[PDB]
């Protein structure tokens, strides 16, 4: 997730005065601190990761649905602190995957 984070415009806006390698280090530290939220921050880019060896044989909608159901399962396993999600937009990434909610 760090290699995609360092090029994301969100990271560039967050840290305008920092080079790419600093963003790579920040991505690594954020991945260590919370892997789930770092995977969530990729948004559409997380379907291009190496998930399975034969993941290219599936239709795109099938892969997206499988990934989304896995995220819903894992997020509802973990739980979301609603006040933090309301205040910190970084933690609000898991709120659409809460059971009964959506984007």
């Amino acid at each position: 997730t760090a290699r995609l984070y360092q090029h994301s415009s969100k990271s560039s806006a967050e840290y305008p005065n920092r080079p790419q390698l600093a963003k790579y280090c920040i991505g690594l530290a954020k991945y260590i601190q919370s892997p789930l939220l770092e995977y969530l921050a990729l948004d559409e880019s997380m379907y291009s990761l190496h998930i399975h060896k034969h993941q290219n044989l599936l239709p795109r909608e099938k892969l997206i649905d499988a990934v989304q159901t896995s995220i819903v399962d894992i997020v509802n396993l973990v739980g979301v602190d609603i006040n933090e999600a309301v205040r910190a937009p970084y933690h609000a990434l898991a709120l659409p995957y809460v059971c009964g909610l959506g984007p």
């Binding site: 305008p16 291009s48 190496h50």
Partner: protein, 387 residues
Amino acid sequence: PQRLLIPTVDDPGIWGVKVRLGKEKDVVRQILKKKLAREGTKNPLEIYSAFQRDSFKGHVYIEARKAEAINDALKGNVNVFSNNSKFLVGIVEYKDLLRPVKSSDVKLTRGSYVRVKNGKFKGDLAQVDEVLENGLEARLKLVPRLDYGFRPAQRLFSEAEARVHEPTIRRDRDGFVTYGGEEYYEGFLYKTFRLQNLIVNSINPTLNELSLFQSNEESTTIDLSTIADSLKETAKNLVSFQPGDNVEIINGELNHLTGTVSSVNQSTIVSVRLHSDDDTINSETVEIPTSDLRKIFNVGDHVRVIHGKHTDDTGLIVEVNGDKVEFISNQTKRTVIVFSNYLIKSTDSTVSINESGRFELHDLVQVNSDLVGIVIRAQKDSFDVLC
């Protein structure tokens, strides 16, 4: 009255004389001083009035009746050039020399959205909450730019983060917060800015800033009068015509008529050849103002987007829902809905992908951990990779 005061033949003449730049008011004051000093003498300065205008640089206009009076008035002055660069002002120009300027805008209206010329908030849209009576400054509603301890991106004032990074916040009212000497009202900065720091015309609004400003009023973009005016201005200015374009007429006696642009002269007169069932009418060319022309888009024509999020996208028109036009793209190969004001009939794409992305053509790009490929075709926001 005002209309009766227009000049006549028997009114005193007006002469204009070129002077050095920046000394016009100095010449005016010197002429007034000499007129006052020589008043009541044997040879008084036989003039009547003298003035100058800031816009008409390098010109000083004196109202008199004799050229010798002008020579006497200019005698003893150093700002006047060596040659007698004097001319007779036409009588019709007398009213024009004293006509006012900047009338378009009686005054700045409170609540309008304006852009900032310079400063740390250079280019950010700001709402005119208050207009100072002096007219040199005005208090404005802005989006704060702070790092809380080269400028940070604009964002609504976060009181909690400000307190965490700096616990020296002061409070005076409810919803009115003072942080770092700057007054923030419910997340929006209220700071006075000078008149010379603002753009009050040709203002281009964005959905993001509009939503960010109207979010605090608990009703999304509730206000749409100035926004509609900005839409009208952008729609009128963005329309550019070319020969051979099929256009339709909105007003005038020739309303609801189709025609093809034959030639374009300047940017306000367009000669159009109309199409109709009568052959004798089809052989006539009519020059029509651009303000009463609307482009005609037929189904199945290559059109290139002028401006917007889908800029430089080409394709074939599929559905024409009046103002809104739908077309299948060429690059993304998907249907895109863009307004008809943003379309130009370009039969070929010829899109250059230079100065985009991070990838030259035929670059060997690592797709993921264990995948690699070569860029085959490049697009504005996508790439084609051969594994």
